[PDB]
Amino acid sequence: MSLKVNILGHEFSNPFMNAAGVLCTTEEDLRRMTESESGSLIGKSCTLAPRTGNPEPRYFGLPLGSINSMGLPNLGVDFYLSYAAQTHDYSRKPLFLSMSGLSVEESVEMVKKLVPITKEKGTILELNLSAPNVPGKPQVGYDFDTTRTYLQKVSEAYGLPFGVKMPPYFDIAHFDMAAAVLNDFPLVKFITCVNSIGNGLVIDPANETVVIKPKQGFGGLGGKYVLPTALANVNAFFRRCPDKLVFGCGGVYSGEEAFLHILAGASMVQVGTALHDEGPIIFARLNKELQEIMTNKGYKTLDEFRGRVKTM
Amino acid sequence: MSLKVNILGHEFSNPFMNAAGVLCTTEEDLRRMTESESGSLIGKSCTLAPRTGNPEPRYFGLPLGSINSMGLPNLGVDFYLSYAAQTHDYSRKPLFLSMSGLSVEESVEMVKKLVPITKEKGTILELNLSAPNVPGKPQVGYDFDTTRTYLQKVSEAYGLPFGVKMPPYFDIAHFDMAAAVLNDFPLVKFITCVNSIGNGLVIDPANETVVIKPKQGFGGLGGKYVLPTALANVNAFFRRCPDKLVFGCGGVYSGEEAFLHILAGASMVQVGTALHDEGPIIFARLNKELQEIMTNKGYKTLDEFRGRVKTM
Ligand SMILES: Cc1cc2nc3c(=O)[nH]c(=O)nc-3n(C[C@H](O)[C@H](O)[C@H](O)COP(=O)(O)O)c2cc1C
Ligand SMILES: Cc1cc2nc3c(=O)[nH]c(=O)nc-3n(C[C@H](O)[C@H](O)[C@H](O)COP(=O)(O)O)c2cc1C
Incomplete structure (x- = not known):
């Protein structure tokens, strides 16, 4: 039995990694991810200059x-x-780095700096097109003209295979429009679906107050909320972008959800909220649980069922 | 305490009604809604000619x-x-009718017929701009140019106050753009937030198969999935459209969720998935639970707390 994944020129021990932003901001964070049983890791979505981010409270765990x-x-x-x-x-x-400049000009400068390190070390780029918690900055992935500009400029400046972190789409027309842009850029080798469901609102009934401070309580949703959306996006791009890889992100708490992502077409599976809740020991659990499901179904490799979801 | 809502010249006993599509397709359905303790009801989103809809299975209840x-x-x-x-x-x-022509032409032809009945009986129009389950028909609400056309032609053809059923938005820029369109049409007196979270995918791990037949398993999500999105949309439009009412729809299972919708700015509160699960007896439960919360908090009327969610 094997959880091995062969993509992007590497042998990953298993398909699991952190979602960008979770357990990957500091050197200590990255050490713990590296020491974990995860198949890979990705650094925090970074900008050209440091940021301390939004005021507190800016995170709230939900049922x-x-x-x-x-x-x-x-x-x-x-x-x-x-x-x-x-x-x-x-x-x-292997290491991924997420880059989330707040303009195309910022992104270009950043990815240029990455070039020599990719060449030397093999570091992989994930370009973030869906940062929904910066006041005054719309999600780039929801503007297909802006998305095309970013992909053109980054393709030109970086000039090596890279991937993109997409926001969730909720309309067949948007899947079609998104794929049409992505399919024009051969350097885009993988698509990560999905980022948070943007700009949700949670209110505490007791004090009649929002639970986070920034943006009048509006924030990105993760966890069990996003699993159906995540699976849909994974499968939509799996079918629409056959010459690209798809990574699954959203709603993974167990081997079962991981299995569903892979069945939908995911090569790698990212873990966000669950990792924030449980810590890096989760990766040991996920490996065991996925192996259990495969044993029960009589699968020896991930290749036996990746992208083999059945329709009626 | 009083649950009464006074809008559009009508007295509603309480803010609760069915969400369009649930318990409102047949005469018997509508009878049961009228017999229920609901404050109002809305007819199934209709088309110019009858439709039998998508092939089976096309509905699946989830945890x-x-x-x-x-x-x-x-x-x-x-x-x-x-x-x-x-x-x-x-x-x-009072009665609402939902109309969901598959083109602006169809919608115009339909609303023209409603005019004399509105004048005579006071029937209220909800124009559906968010139908996500018709193959080849994108959600109108996600194209602001198309939305503007619909509102223009329907405003002209109907010439009476009406409301709109909107798809959920997930970006602040989209709230701004949607509101800019809506605020140009004074006959649009209410906005219903939200329709289903469109085009999610559920897969059964046992048989590795999607759970619904149409569109390769892609369907609209309702219930607990949609509550934070619903509240966000309600609040966003409540603040951006002060000359209009906002109706809340999404994730209501209890008086607590109803309270949150109203706190976010909802005038009426619609119940979809929970009603499908429980039947029209739910409306008696919802009235009781909301009355309890208001009694506990010392709110005499809904107007004491509607749209008075606190931010930090
Ligand atoms: C605390 C936190 C920080 C995040 N930071 C980032 C980030 O920097 N860049 C990014 O692309 N996504 C970020 N995300 C989104 C996650 O990568 C992920 O797409 C989302 O949480 C859905 O996965 P989940 O359901 O496993 O949480 C963050 C999410 C959380 C909860
Ligand atoms: C079986 C079913 C049928 C629906 N039919 C319609 C419809 O005809 N028109 C419409 O605007 N929304 C329709 N909806 C969406 C609901 O009106 C509602 O917006 C959505 O279910 C979210 O509310 P909930 O979380 O209470 O289910 C339907 C939903 C379901 C589950």
Whole structure:
């Protein structure tokens, strides 16, 4: 039995990694992810300069998941580049870096700095097109003209295979429009579906008050809320972008959800809210649970069922 | 305490009604809604000609809500107009009709027929801009140019106060854009937030198969999945459209959820998945539970706390 994944020139021990933003902001965070049983890890979505993010409280755990408006707190691109170049143990597992400049000009500058490190170390880029908690900045993925600009400029500046973190789409027309843009950029090798369901609102009935401070309580939803949306996006892009990989992100708490993501077409599976709740020990549990499901169904590899969801 | 709502010249006994599509397709359905303790009712989203809708299975109840791809099965506009004109007991409660033509032309033809019945009986129009389960028909509400056309032509053709059923939005820029369109049409007196979270996917791990037949398993999500999205949309439009009412729809299972909707700014509160689960007895329960919360908090009327959610 094997959870191994062969993509992007690497052998991943298993399909699991952290979702960008969870357990990956500091050196200590990244150490714990590297020491975990995860198949990979991704750094916090970074900007050209450091950010401390939004005021508190900006995170609230829910029965059915989480709401957050973190506001992209990060140590700046130079920190994560230095981590990728000097600190990270590539013998343990491959490294992704998430980059989320607040303009195309910022992104271009950032990805240019990554080029030499990708060439030297093999660090992988995930371009974030769906940061929903920065006041005054719309999610790039919801504007297909802006998305096309970003992909053109980053393709030009970076010039190596990279991936994109997409916001969730809720309309067949949007899947079609999104795929049409993505399919025009051959350097986009993977699509991560999905980021948080943006701009939800949670109110405490007792004090009649919102539970987070930023943006009048509006924040991104994660966890059990997002699983059906996540599976739909994974499967939609799996079918619409056959020349690209799809990574699943959203609502993974168990091997069962991981199995569903992979069945829908996911190559790798990212874990956000559940990891925030449980800590990096979750990866050991997820490996065991996924292996259990496969044993019960008589599958030896992930390849036996990846993307083999049945329709009626 | 009083649950009464006084809007559009009508007295509503309480803020509760069915969500369009649930318990409102047939004459018997509408009878049961009229007999219930609900403050109002709305007819199934109808088309110019009858429709039998999508093939089976097209509905699946979930632990956390529902997925459906009904495909607007309805008896045609003539049936609902006849119900509104001849059958409905207006002494029991006011009636809304939902109209969901698959083109602006169809919608215009339908609303023209309603005009004399509105004038005579006081039937209220909810124009559906968010039908997500018709193959080849995108949700109108996600195209602001198309939305503007619909509101223009329907405003002209109907010429009386009406409301709109909106799809959920997930970006602040979209709230701004939607509100800019809506605020140009003074005849739009209410906004219903929200329709289903469109195009989710549920997969059964046992048989590795999607749970509904239409559109490769893709269907609208309702129930516990949608509450934070619903509250966000209600509050966003409550603040952006001060010349209009907002109706809340999504994730109502209890008086507590109803309270949150009203706190967010809802005038009426619609019940979909929970009503499908429980039957029209739910309306008696909802009245009791909301009265209890208001008694506990010392609120004499809904107007004491409507839209008075606190931010930090
Ligand atoms: C605290 C927190 C921080 C996050 N930070 C980022 C981030 O920096 N970049 C990003 O692309 N997504 C970020 N996300 C979104 C997650 O990567 C993920 O897409 C989302 O939480 C859905 O997965 P889940 O259901 O497992 O939580 C963050 C989510 C949380 C809860
Ligand atoms: C079986 C079913 C049929 C529906 N039919 C319609 C419809 O005809 N028109 C409409 O605007 N919404 C329709 N909806 C959406 C609901 O009106 C409502 O917006 C959605 O279910 C969210 O509310 P809930 O969380 O209480 O279910 C339907 C939903 C379900 C579950």
